[PDB]
Ligand binder design. Structure first.
Ligand SMILES: COc1cncc(-c2cnc(NC3CCNCC3)c3[nH]c(=O)c(C)cc23)c1
Length: 127
């Protein structure tokens, strides 16, 4: 089966900016989910080999994880906050697609998503 390369975390042909929303996404939103007790399985791409999940990248063709999101924020990969929020949504949806309901990992994703939405609700205004 084997893993794909991780998602892109840099792009030399994309302009860059630091904004209030992006800073909040790293310092408050990502930081808060990162330190959650359920965070670790989502802190890096799913290693289908080590975990023995050979069909993972057959089923999930748009992988995403918080390690990638963190690196994207640190590398100024996102221009719009929406890009980052979309990546979180993709991560959670992947989990709901690949795993079975009631799997420990699905409940963990549910709790993390609730927390995520709580924090996105207090995102500072665009400007
Ligand atoms: C360091 O990464 C991990 C740590 N702990 C757990 C996982 C993990 C394990 N199993 C998964 N799926 C199986 C659960 C039991 N039923 C068959 C599928 C996982 N699925 C996922 O989507 C993620 C993100 C982690 C994971 C990854």
């Amino acid at each position: 089966s084997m893993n794909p390369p991780p998602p892109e975390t840099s792009n030399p042909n994309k302009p860059k900016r630091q904004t209030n929303q992006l800073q909040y996404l790293l310092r408050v939103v990502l930081k808060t989910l990162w330190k959650h007790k359920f965070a670790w399985p989502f802190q890096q791409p799913v290693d289908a080999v080590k975990l023995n999940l050979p069909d993972y990248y057959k089923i999930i063709k748009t992988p995403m994880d918080m390690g990638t999101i963190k690196k994207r924020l640190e590398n100024n990969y996102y221009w719009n906050a929406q890009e980052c929020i979309q990546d979180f949504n993709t991560m959670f949806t992947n989990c709901y697609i690949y795993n079975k309901p009631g799997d420990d990992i699905v409940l963990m994703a549910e709790a993390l998503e609730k927390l995520f939405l709580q924090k996105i609700n207090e995102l500072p205004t665009e400007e």
